Amino acid sequence: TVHIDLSALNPELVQAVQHVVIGPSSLIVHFNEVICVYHGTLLDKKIHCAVKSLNRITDIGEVSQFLTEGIIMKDFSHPNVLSLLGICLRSEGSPLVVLPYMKHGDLRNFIRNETHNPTVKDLIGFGLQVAKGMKFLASKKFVHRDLAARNCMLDEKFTVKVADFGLARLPVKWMALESLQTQKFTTKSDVWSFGVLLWELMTRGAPPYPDVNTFDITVYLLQGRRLLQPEYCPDPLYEVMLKCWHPKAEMRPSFSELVSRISAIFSTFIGEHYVHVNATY
Numbered sequence: 520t521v522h523i524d525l526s527a528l529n530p531e532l533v534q535a536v537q538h539v540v541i542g543p544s545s546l547i548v549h550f551n552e553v554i555c556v557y558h559g560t561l562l563d564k565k566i567h568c569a570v571k572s573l574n575r576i577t578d579i580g581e582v583s584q585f586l587t588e589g590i591i592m593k594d595f596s597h598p599n600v601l602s603l604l605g606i607c608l609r610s611e612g613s614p615l616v617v618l619p620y621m622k623h624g625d626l627r628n629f630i631r632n633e634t635h636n637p638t639v640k641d642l643i644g645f646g647l648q649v650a651k652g653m654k655f656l657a658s659k660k661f662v663h664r665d666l667a668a669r670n671c672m673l674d675e676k677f678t679v680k681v682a683d684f685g686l687a688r689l690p691v692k693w694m695a696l697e698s699l700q701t702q703k704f705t706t707k708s709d710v711w712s713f714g715v716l717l718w719e720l721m722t723r724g725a726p727p728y729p730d731v732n733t734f735d736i737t738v739y740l741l742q743g744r745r746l747l748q749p750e751y752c753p754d755p756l757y758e759v760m761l762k763c764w765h766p767k768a769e770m771r772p773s774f775s776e777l778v779s780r781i782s783a784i785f786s787t788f789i790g791e792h793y794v795h796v797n798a799t800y
């Protein structure tokens with residue numbers, strides 16, 4: 520029930536965030552059409568968008584951090600990274616985050632869907648797109664911390680966008696050994712998660728370590744274990760996954776190396792090997 524006067528904001532920051540701000544007459548939010556996220560329309564040209572309605576922000580410092588995140592995220596521009604279209608801050612501190620509409624939803628549900636018929640080539644292609652997204656994010660010194668198939672999205676062109684970061688924001692079965700032990704995250708721990716994401720792809724969305732207790736992952740891994748090679752995962756791609764899970768963080772490949780290696784493996788396929796679901800998954 521706290522009142523907030525937005526005019527108490529620093530005029531320099533308000534000026535700095537203007538290119539991120541969407542005018543009230545530029546966006547028609549379809550509160551009737553619910554995806555808390557709603558369908559929206561943006562003008563440029565009618566543009567379909569996803570409008571994430573955040574909880575009301577009643578602290579000027581929090582409003583300030585919201586506007587600052589918006590500015591930084593606005594410059595995270597890449598074909599395989601979810602873009603911020605802009606932000607709205609309504610009267611009384613009610614925020615809207617405007618993101619591009621993702622027609623085919625999250626990548627995990629997409630590959631799981633038994634009516635979709637992915638090939639080995641399709642699935643590796645998805646992995647490659649994610650690696651390109653991550654190569655970009657790493658170049659910006661941005662550590663994702665929650666990379667997973669569920670956290671990537673697909674548009675109408677089947678372009679994969681790394682999402683669930685910034686204003687679009689423990690996953691222990693995607694976490695590197697050193698992160699489980701120290702609670703610190705790096706680009707090299709994102710590479711570990713990317714390895715698990717590749718496993719998710721080649722299994723068409725199977726949960727990693729099915730019979731394994733969430734609380735018991737460090738002890739499991741320390742017995743000398745890794746995720747098994749999926750039935751439809753090519754040997755060189757499984758070798759890549761094993762490199763992503765190297766016990767020495769510094770010995771794991773960079774995302775730039777992953778893009779290179781995966782592009783090569785991808786190139787050898789012609790879209791003739793269909794990927795079917797594991798009976799046990």
Ligand SMILES: Cn1cc(-c2ccc3nnc(Sc4ccc5ncccc5c4)n3n2)cn1
Pocket residue numbers: 554556569571601618619620621622624625628669670671672682683684687688
């Ligand atoms: C199961 N699931 C995971 C997600 C998801 C993932 C990452 C992520 N990063 N930002 C968002 S919000 C968003 C953004 C665009 C959308 N486009 C279409 C439908 C839903 C949409 C939701 N997400 N949403 C949605 N369902």
Ligand SMILES: [Cl-]
Pocket residue numbers: 638639640641788789790791792793
């Ligand atoms: Cl294929």
